[PDB]
Design an enzyme around this catalytic site. Structure first.
Site, short mmCIF file in Angstrom:
data_model
loop_
_atom_site.label_atom_id
_atom_site.label_comp_id
_atom_site.label_asym_id
_atom_site.label_seq_id
_atom_site.Cartn_x
_atom_site.Cartn_y
_atom_site.Cartn_z
N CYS A 1 0.82 -1.20 0.00
CA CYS A 1 0.00 0.00 0.00
C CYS A 1 0.86 1.26 0.00
CB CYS A 1 -0.94 0.01 1.21
SG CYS A 1 -0.10 0.12 2.81
N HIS B 1 -1.64 1.18 7.53
CA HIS B 1 -2.16 1.13 6.17
C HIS B 1 -2.15 2.52 5.57
CE1 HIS B 1 -4.33 0.10 2.64
NE2 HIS B 1 -5.35 0.87 2.96
#
Ligand SMILES: [Zn+2]
Lengths: 75, 299
Positions: B14, B256
């Site tokens: 990510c 994240h």
């Protein structure tokens, strides 16, 4: 010589170094006064992240230079 | 529907997908890449990077399109950044790997440096004699701002002023006072880049001796005037516009990355991109996010 490190809080500390010193040696000296392990340090100069293994000579870091210290945020 | 392609996450990737969505939302950067890679029509990082960004800078060509960017990671893993393909990494560190690779690729000359490249000044005067050591100019590719500490509302302007404020530096060798002694040091901005990357440092060091994630919300605006932080008294106005935001959720070890960016015209419509998932997002959600990397472009 004598260089500057812009620290995590924005305070700028002074370091005594030689152009022959490696930056792991410099990360060691930042640990001495800031307590940051070398593996957790990211030193940036002239838009370049400084690579452990090289000396300050390869990056042409001269006297009164300002290095910037930032941590690594994984995600 | 004005949606860009998504990017598959092949193992804590990510950090790359969020940066690529942000970079492709910066039109000046893509125009520079096209100009820079045009010489090859007379391998390389720029060609691999432009292929992905050109695709991500336009609306998807097929419904719910998902691309894979790990060709980019492969070439960086081979030549510029020795990292795993599955461990979590910092999107700001990757930005500097990419930016360093492109400056190395350009070095090998009528073409301009990439638009992220700026220069900062460092002035220093000894408080003892009051003589002003020569100014020092260093380049920068991003501004890494410390987040200050009841701070009422916290603003990006506050973080910038703190980065630009003067400080007291003890124990430096004055050439006139010949010596050590105590100096006043201050950083200003000499040359502003056309593309401005702002890094809000969300990792601090605790009094105990352990990193601390900074969750505090820093208020930022769609429009940013950078005049107050210039070194030199020139008459040119310096107005910037928000192109994209990279947001980090989670703690220090785990986390994240997510990205808010503008929709591409084939404008004032925003997208929330989380790896393979693209949603329409309102400007209100964008301005309320916990920014980590801010991409501004000069207007
Ligand atoms: Zn003096």
């Amino acid at each position: 010589m004598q260089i500057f490190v812009k620290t995590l809080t924005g305070k700028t500390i002074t370091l005594e170094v030689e152009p022959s010193d490696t930056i792991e040696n410099v990360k060691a000296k930042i640990q001495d006064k800031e307590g940051i392990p070398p593996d957790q340090q990211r030193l940036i100069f002239a838009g370049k992240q400084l690579e452990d293994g090289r000396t300050l000579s390869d990056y042409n870091i001269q006297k009164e230079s300002t290095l910037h210290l930032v941590l690594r945020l994984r995600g | 529907k004005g949606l860009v392609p998504g990017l598959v996450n092949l193992g804590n990737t990510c950090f790359m997908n969020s940066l690529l969505q942000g970079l492709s939302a910066c039109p000046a950067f893509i125009r520079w890449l096209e100009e820079f890679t045009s010489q090859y029509s007379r391998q390389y990082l720029s060609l691999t990077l432009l292929h992905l960004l050109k695709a991500l800078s336009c609306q998807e060509v097929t419904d719910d399109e998902v691309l894979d960017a790990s060709c980019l990671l492969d070439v960086l893993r081979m030549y510029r950044w020795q990292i795993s393909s599955f461990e979590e990494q910092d999107a700001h560190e990757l930005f500097h790997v990419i930016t360093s690779s492109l400056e190395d690729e350009r070095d090998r000359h009528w073409k301009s440096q990439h638009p992220f490249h700026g220069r900062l000044t460092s002035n220093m005067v000894c408080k003892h004699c009051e003589h002003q050591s020569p100014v020092r100019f260093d380049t920068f590719d991003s501004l890494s701002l410390s987040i200050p500490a009841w701070g009422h509302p916290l603003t990006l302007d506050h973080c910038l002023h703190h980065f630009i404020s003067s400080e007291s530096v003890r124990d430096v060798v004055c050439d006139n006072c010949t010596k050590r002694t105590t100096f006043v040091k201050q950083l200003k901005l000499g040359k502003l880049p056309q593309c401005l990357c702002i890094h809000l440092q969300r990792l601090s060091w605790s009094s105990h001796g352990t990193p601390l994630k900074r969750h505090e919300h820093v208020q930022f605006n769609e429009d940013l005037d950078m005049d107050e932080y210039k070194y030199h008294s020139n008459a040119s106005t310096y107005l910037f516009r928000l192109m994209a935001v990279v947001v980090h959720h989670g703690d220090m070890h785990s986390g994240h990355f997510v990205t808010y960016r503008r929709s591409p015209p084939s404008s004032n419509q925003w997208l929330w991109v989380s790896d393979d998932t693209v949603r329409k997002a309102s400007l209100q959600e964008v301005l309320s996010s916990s920014a980590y990397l801010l991409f501004y472009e000069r207007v």
